[PDB]
Amino acid sequence: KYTVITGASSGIGYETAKLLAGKGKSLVLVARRTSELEKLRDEVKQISPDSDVILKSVDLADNQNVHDLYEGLKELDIETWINNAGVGDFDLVQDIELGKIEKMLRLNIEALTILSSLFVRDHHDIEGTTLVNISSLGGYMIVPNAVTYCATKFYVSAYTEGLAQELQKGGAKLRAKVLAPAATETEFVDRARGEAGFDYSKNVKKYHTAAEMAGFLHQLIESDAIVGIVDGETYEFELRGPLFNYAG
Amino acid sequence: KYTVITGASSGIGYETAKLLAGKGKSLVLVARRTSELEKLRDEVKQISPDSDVILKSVDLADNQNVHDLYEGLKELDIETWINNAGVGDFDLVQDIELGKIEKMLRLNIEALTILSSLFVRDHHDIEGTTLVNISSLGGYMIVPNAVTYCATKFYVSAYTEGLAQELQKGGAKLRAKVLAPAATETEFVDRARGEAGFDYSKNVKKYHTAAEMAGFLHQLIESDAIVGIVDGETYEFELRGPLFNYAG
Ligand SMILES: NC(=O)c1ccc[n+]([C@@H]2O[C@H](COP(=O)([O-])OP(=O)(O)OC[C@H]3O[C@@H](n4cnc5c(N)ncnc54)[C@H](OP(=O)(O)O)[C@@H]3O)[C@@H](O)[C@H]2O)c1
Numbered sequence: 001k002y003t004v005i006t007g008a009s010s011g012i013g014y015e016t017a018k019l020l021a022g023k024g025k026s027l028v029l030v031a032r033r034t035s036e037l038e039k040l041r042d043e044v045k046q047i048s049p050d051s052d053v054i055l056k057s058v059d060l061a062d063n064q065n066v067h068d069l070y071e072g073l074k075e076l077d078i079e080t081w082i083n084n085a086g087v088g089d090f091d092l093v094q095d096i097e098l099g100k101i102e103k104m105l106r107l108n109i110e111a112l113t114i115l116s117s118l119f120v121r122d123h124h125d126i127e128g129t130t131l132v133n134i135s136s137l138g139g140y141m142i143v144p145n146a147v148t149y150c151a152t153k154f155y156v157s158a159y160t161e162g163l164a165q166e167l168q169k170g171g172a173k174l175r176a177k178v179l180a181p182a183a184t185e186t187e188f189v190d191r192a193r194g195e196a197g198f199d200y201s202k203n204v205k206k207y208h209t210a211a212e213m214a215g216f217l218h219q220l221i222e223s224d225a226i227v228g229i230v231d232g233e234t235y236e237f238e239l240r241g242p243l244f245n246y247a248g
Numbered sequence: 249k250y251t252v253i254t255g256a257s258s259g260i261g262y263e264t265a266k267l268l269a270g271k272g273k274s275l276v277l278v279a280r281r282t283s284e285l286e287k288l289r290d291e292v293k294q295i296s297p298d299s300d301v302i303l304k305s306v307d308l309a310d311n312q313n314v315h316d317l318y319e320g321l322k323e324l325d326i327e328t329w330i331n332n333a334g335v336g337d338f339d340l341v342q343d344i345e346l347g348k349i350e351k352m353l354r355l356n357i358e359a360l361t362i363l364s365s366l367f368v369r370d371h372h373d374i375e376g377t378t379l380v381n382i383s384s385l386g387g388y389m390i391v392p393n394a395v396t397y398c399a400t401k402f403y404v405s406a407y408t409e410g411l412a413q414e415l416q417k418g419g420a421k422l423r424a425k426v427l428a429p430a431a432t433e434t435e436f437v438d439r440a441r442g443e444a445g446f447d448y449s450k451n452v453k454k455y456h457t458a459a460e461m462a463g464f465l466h467q468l469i470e471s472d473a474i475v476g477i478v479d480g481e482t483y484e485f486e487l488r489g490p491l492f493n494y495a496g
């Protein structure tokens with residue numbers, strides 16, 4: 001029985017793999033950097049010798065890549081699916097690189113939608129399955145100079161909040177949860193601005209570590225809440241219900 | 249000086265074209281059905297003989313099609329650009345057809361974002377320019393049995409509210425606005441559920457006509473408001489500022 005983590009090679013996804021390793025889970029680790037994946041597998045195996053680990057070097061910004069990934073995993077007994085892979089961009093709309101933004105839409109929205117839909121299709125009446133989508137506090141609150149990114153996270157928030165409440169109204173066994181982290185110390189900002197070495201310690205007053213966020217992720221799965229969100233003012237992690245208006 | 253209307257071959261975008269023709273506007277009308285576009289052009293020319301009308305039979309669910317479209321109109325004086333083309337789907341996530349949902353993302357989110365981005369890049373400091381993105385009350389309110397579509401309208405809402413406030417803080421001359429219609433008598437229902445014939449008169453208790461929505465759209469342009477949103481209870485058209493939290 002497997003937990004699937006896209007974007008496992010660094011950051012939130014990486015620390016989540018090490019946490020579920022310590023809980024003895026078997027994992028499917030997806031990302032492009034095979035070198036990083038094989039590195040994380042070794043740590044998983046050292047943490048948890050009897051945990052089986054499958055790697056998938058896959059660029060999820062391509063739509064058939066996404067379909068092929070899920071088709072390759074149907075042989076498997078998946079209890080948890082985590083759409084963690086995701087990139088930002090810090091730029092005015094007038095200055096964006098259309099190709100980077102397009103890649104972002106395809107990763108942040110499409111891959112997550114395709115994978116959520118296929119998983120929902122196949123696991124909606126299977127007891128004990130969970131679907132976790134990673135959004136951001138920026139999916140509930142627009143941040144200046146990250147308009148296009150925030151909009152992809154509002155999509156993930158509204159998508160997953162609606163899907164969660166759809167499954168509840170339908171008595172589905174599958175559970176669907178959305179995580180909304182705040183400043184988390186990952187490679188997200190370096191990747192977003194295109195240059196490495198941004199120092200959270202020196203530049204950001206409030207932020208969680210990736211290992212902390214992996215724990216909040218684990219709390220969310222182990223709970224009845226649809227939303228696990230970091231409050232922007234207190235920086236507390238709160239398990240709670242949907243934030244967006246629902247017509248049901 | 250031209251107003252670009254995507255999804256002009258029916259519904260809101262069509263009635264808008266006629267309304268603007270009655271104002272003497274020149275029009276770029278984009279859609280797939282050349283049949284419906286030519287017919288509209290005849291009607292526009294009868295309304296307004298000296299209005300120039302350019303037709304563009306384009307499928308905007310293809311990202312290269314979207315790019316080609318903008319590049320073909322870079323030789324025009326565009327004052328207003330209206331991202332109106334969009335489709336819905338009524339279905340549980342577990343039942344969606346992956347292809348229709350994917351095209352919906354490509355149309356509702358990507359095309360709108362690509363055309364929004366290029367227009368902003370080229371027009372932000374051109375006096376008297378306006379960008380209008382057509383969301384829905386479903387972009388501020390999740391609706392059961394339409395989770396994915398709502399999600400795409402939440403994206404359109406957050407993106408355009410973000411962009412609008414971005415341009416304001418920067419002293420742009422370009423104005424960005426979002427229209428959030430409620431039940432609007434168009435082909436939208438038929439296209440979502442894949443068969444023709446849905447009767448608003450007999451099935452929907454509250455709804456605007458497509459001509460009414462064209463009027464709210466026009467009043468939105470003739471306003472200093474970022475959001476024009478129909479109230480779901482009273483069905484009043486309200487011109488107001490953003491609805492989502494902004495961190496600026
Ligand atoms: N960090 C924060 O402050 C923060 C705040 C709110 C939300 N988030 C959300 O956190 C999630 C995790 O990101 P992170 O903060 O941990 O950042 P990160 O350290 O940059 O990790 C991003 C992950 O996504 C993978 N990825 C990126 N593009 C990919 C692609 N095209 N195909 C496949 N995998 C791809 C990366 O691996 P490869 O490079 O190997 O492909 C990596 O494993 C994201 O969804 C992000 O939006 C983060």
Ligand SMILES: NC(=O)c1ccc[n+]([C@@H]2O[C@H](COP(=O)([O-])OP(=O)(O)OC[C@H]3O[C@@H](n4cnc5c(N)ncnc54)[C@H](OP(=O)(O)O)[C@@H]3O)[C@@H](O)[C@H]2O)c1
Pocket residue numbers: 254255256257258259260261278279280281282284306307308309332333334335336355382383384385386428429430431432433434435436437439
């Ligand atoms: N009607 C409502 O209840 C309601 C409420 C809120 C929001 N809205 C929004 O209103 C907007 C306009 O739709 P409508 O309600 O007027 O419905 P509609 O009558 O179906 O019009 C949609 C338009 O989009 C065009 N279109 C669809 N797919 C396209 C594609 N792939 N490429 C290019 N053009 C495409 C259609 O023309 P072709 O098929 O000829 O290409 C048509 O002109 C949409 O954004 C919709 O979400 C509608």
